[PDB]
């Protein structure tokens, strides 16, 4: 007649909308990727695959006295669905606190919830970065068709506006342009985010205004790297089928654990908006 | 019915109080602790911390007509607030007991029951007279200033409760008598039975008189050690969360296991009214 | 935590275990099933044989000959076989707004491999736990069912078992269970006339001849069909229950509870 | 519907019969579940347009 | 209230399985569970009679 059990739901509705409320704000904090992103709406918990178009188009518009330019775009082979993973954590929750925030001291604590969510966000922003290869996905900095491009000049006073110059350069050189983002590794931001650059204010103000979409920071990649892309649509995607939401696993020995889900799925319809090192 | 599964709760009515009396009553036989140990009030399953009060205090305390003598009360050496352990064990129903003792055979077989209880008595009757080290926790042949005598003469009848004897004069010296109690080893225990010549008496009937409280054996004391102790109130106590309680844990492989539980502390607020070997 | 399933689903997944259960149970075709005891029940009263007592007194008045009973009272324990299998919660969503089928075929594999299970113990009792087979019982009324592939096969073999059993003052309507092998190159259609050697055994049977793929390759059978001969004490028929969601996955078991108590191992032909 | 799940490989576990239930019957996939795509097959009907005209007012 | 409870840190597991399904990774959870006295702060100050009077009669 009393708390023991393994009973379903065992958090009231307030302490059930307290929980979602932290996920959410936690995840719109640390995420980075779906910000120089844009996402394919929620297509709901169902929806395991969807399509990923094939690569490349070199066939421009064309404009003539009298349309008969036939302006074919057309995937030549197959289309190579591809399926939606999911990512997790735990909250292992003692059941004592459960009860003394029924009829005694009663500021439930969820910080569990917040750390797993950021444990989450932090492992969902890497996929994004860098496809695992157990699943065989792609990653911005490990995808086919990159672009390469030497930095091997920061360290100076102003030895890093050259490089993002030449990124773009060579960005438009395969006739696609537009308003561009960058993410930066943490070192790598910070250095460029000295000294007046000798001709002027602060680097990171012109190279900000050189994008047009913002310059990110990112913990997630690698030491000395980074990337610059084209936010629009057409180009690349974020298909998500639910997003960050906690659920109840199961009853453990006498606590509760939950885990936390959201389905993302990134897609390059165009393996030439993306520029590394 | 039995195959729907994870039900809130398997057993009906009488079954849970069938459980809950076996469990109770093979913890009161097999608990010694208990016996020399006034225990706190059933705080609650929500309280997880007790105020460890005490660890010393004098005020002889004298009296006049008027009534005037200023005193100091004994308030506390310093708050301390120790944390409740949990003391648990585990047992399993084979889901067909369950449904053969609603037609067949009408009062349920617990046997299981009492073979966990007996392991969770033991196991906090080791924690009482035992610490861990790994919770900080005190115990009763573990505690600093115990008093230690040596004691080892035995063998010759011609001794033995002169160790009693020079526990109980130790205890006094330090200001401390009461009503004494005495918890030994099985291997002394044994040894003070013996019928060696020139009998008279045998030693246990003088130290019951002496102590008067009554000289308890427990197994789960180590081989070569005892204890002498002063049974009242404001030397010792047993702080009690909840007592023994039988909960569920889910259903696992269709079958149904069950937990024993009970949150106990033993706080010695005098560690002076100890004798150790 | 909760109960995955809704009725529609459950009611499937229910039929689809039912189908593939009396599709593949050879041994509920030839024996008669003591009524189903319910999940209470785990043990049941067992045999009675070599009761040697002619009874044929035959005086007016009546003797004090000696009565039937069993030989020697025990109990044995209703075992329980089981399959496992599992389901994805994306699976039931997407069956639930994209598709409709719902597939189930870990289940109709588990109920195949749960029957499967019960037919080796029918026909073979576990060793290990200890029980009657009946290509091993004790009392089994060997007789050779050698040198056939030969015109006269099968049929030489057939009466030799029944008139062992007729002689064991045990007969009936028979019924005969063969390997695969036997059962198919059986078919020597040419007995003399025009009549399948099969089609005659099976008139000598008059309850039908059939084959379990189970067997050995060179082994049959033949029992006597009545009750009170052979029993299938069953506790609860094949069905599907839920184990309890664990990390979001819902796993699910088919059950089955049946033990064969042989009354009369009176009634057994092997090779 | 595009796509279906394709199920890993075989298993070797069969089931198991004792006393009371603690076999776990484990049959569980493994990494990934490699879903795969349904592909469609076609012709052609080459129909004359005088043909149906003639099979409404006429041989038909 | 006296007591509540403590941190958790050190929490490395990267929970980033990311696998359909579910992989079995470790869960977050206090560290080393334990709890903390929370003190109490004061300063004390004083008043006279004859201020409150004064104050009552003839300033305010």
Redesign the interface.
């Known amino acids: 007649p009393?708390?023991?059990?393994?009973?379903?739901?065992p958090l009231r509705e307030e302490e059930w909308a307290r929980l979602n409320e932290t996920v959410i704000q936690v995840a719109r904090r640390s995420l980075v990727g779906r910000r120089i992103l844009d996402i394919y709406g929620p297509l709901?918990?169902?929806?395991?695959?969807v399509?990923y178009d094939e690569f490349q188009g070199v066939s421009p518009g064309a404009v003539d006295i009298v349309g008969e330019q036939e302006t074919a775009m057309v995937f030549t082979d197959a289309?190579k669905?591809?399926?939606i993973?999911?990512?997790?954590?735990?909250?292992?929750l003692?059941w004592?606190?459960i009860?003394?925030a029924?009829?005694?001291?009663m500021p439930l604590?969820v910080?569990?919830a917040a750390?797993?969510a950021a444990?989450?966000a932090?492992?969902?922003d890497?996929?994004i970065f860098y496809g695992?290869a157990?699943?065989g996905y792609e990653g911005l900095m490990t995808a086919n068709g990159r672009l390469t491009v030497p930095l091997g000049d920061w360290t100076s006073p102003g030895g890093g506006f050259q490089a993002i110059v030449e990124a773009t350069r060579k960005l438009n050189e395969q006739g696609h342009f537009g308003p561009y983002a960058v993410v930066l590794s943490p070192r790598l931001y910070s250095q460029l985010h000295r000294i007046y650059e000798k001709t002027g204010v602060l680097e990171i103000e012109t190279i900000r205004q050189l994008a047009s979409d913002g310059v990110y920071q990112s913990n997630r990649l690698r030491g000395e790297s980074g990337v610059v892309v084209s936010t629009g649509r057409e180009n690349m995607d974020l298909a998500v089928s639910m997003d960050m939401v906690a659920?109840?696993?199961?009853?453990s020995?006498?606590n509760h654990?939950f885990?936390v889900l959201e389905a993302l799925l990134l897609r390059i319809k165009h393996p030439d908006a993306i520029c590394t090192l």
């Open positions: 009393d708390f023991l059990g393994h009973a379903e739901n709901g918990a169902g929806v395991q695959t399509p289309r669905f591809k399926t993973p999911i990512i997790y954590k735990d909250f292992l003692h004592r606190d009860e003394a029924r009829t005694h001291n604590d910080s569990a750390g797993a444990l989450c932090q492992q969902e890497e996929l695992d157990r699943l659920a109840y696993l199961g009853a020995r006498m654990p885990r």
